[PDB]
Curated annotation (Swiss-Prot):
Induction: Expressed late in the viral replication. This is Endolysin. Keywords: Antimicrobial, Bacteriolytic enzyme, Cytolysis, Glycosidase, Host cell lysis by virus, Host cytoplasm, Hydrolase, Viral release from host cell. The keyword Transmembrane helix does not apply. The lineage of its organism: Viruses, Duplodnaviria, Heunggongvirae, Uroviricota, Caudoviricetes. Gene3D superfamilies: 1.10.530.40.
Length: 164
């Protein structure tokens, strides 16, 4: 298991524009196109992202290319955030993947709260952090996924993704 396999499990793979859990146009492996209600706006974002006139459908290779860019972007976003970098640096590789997973799903920029959760992770109070992370819109809206990510933070193992 690694961050790519983990997110692939959590995000799925769809080659045609579809709506994510929040109702937003998305494609590939969790690649958010726009929060705009306009499908045309979403298709324009897609064409720009891929570099060709697609009309809503991409190939698996193209989906994996956006995925590589998105994971890279989540990692660089973490390292450029003065608040997240110290937490990421304090974690082992498995928990670092859990943090990348959260950033991939909700972004670094524009994310409200979680200051206390991050403080508990940096303190390595795994059980307390796990409880705290669950008191969130994030957990309530996508509980099965949040549970897997939280279990990863609580245990530092891939148990939530094995046999899954
Ligand atoms: S460690 C929890 C956390 C803090 C903040 C910077 C708000 N984030 O985006 C996540 C959800 C990673």
């Amino acid at each position: 298991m690694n961050i790519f396999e983990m997110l692939r499990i959590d995000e799925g793979l769809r080659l045609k524009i579809y709506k994510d859990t929040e109702g937003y146009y998305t494609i590939g492996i969790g690649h958010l196109l726009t929060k705009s209600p306009s499908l045309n706006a979403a298709k324009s974002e897609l064409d720009k992202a891929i570099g060709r006139n697609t009309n809503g459908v991409i190939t698996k290779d193209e989906a994996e290319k956006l995925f590589n860019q998105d994971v890279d972007a989540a990692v660089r976003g973490i390292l450029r955030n003065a608040k997240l970098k110290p937490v990421y640096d304090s974690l082992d590789a498995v928990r670092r993947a859990a943090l990348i997973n959260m950033v991939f799903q909700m972004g670094e920029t524009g994310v409200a709260g979680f200051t206390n959760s991050c403080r508990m992770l940096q303190q390595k109070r795994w059980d307390e952090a796990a409880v705290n992370l669950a008191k969130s819109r994030w957990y309530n809206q996508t509980p099965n996924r949040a549970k897997r990510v939280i279990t990863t933070f609580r245990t530092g193992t891939w148990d939530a993704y094995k046999n899954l």
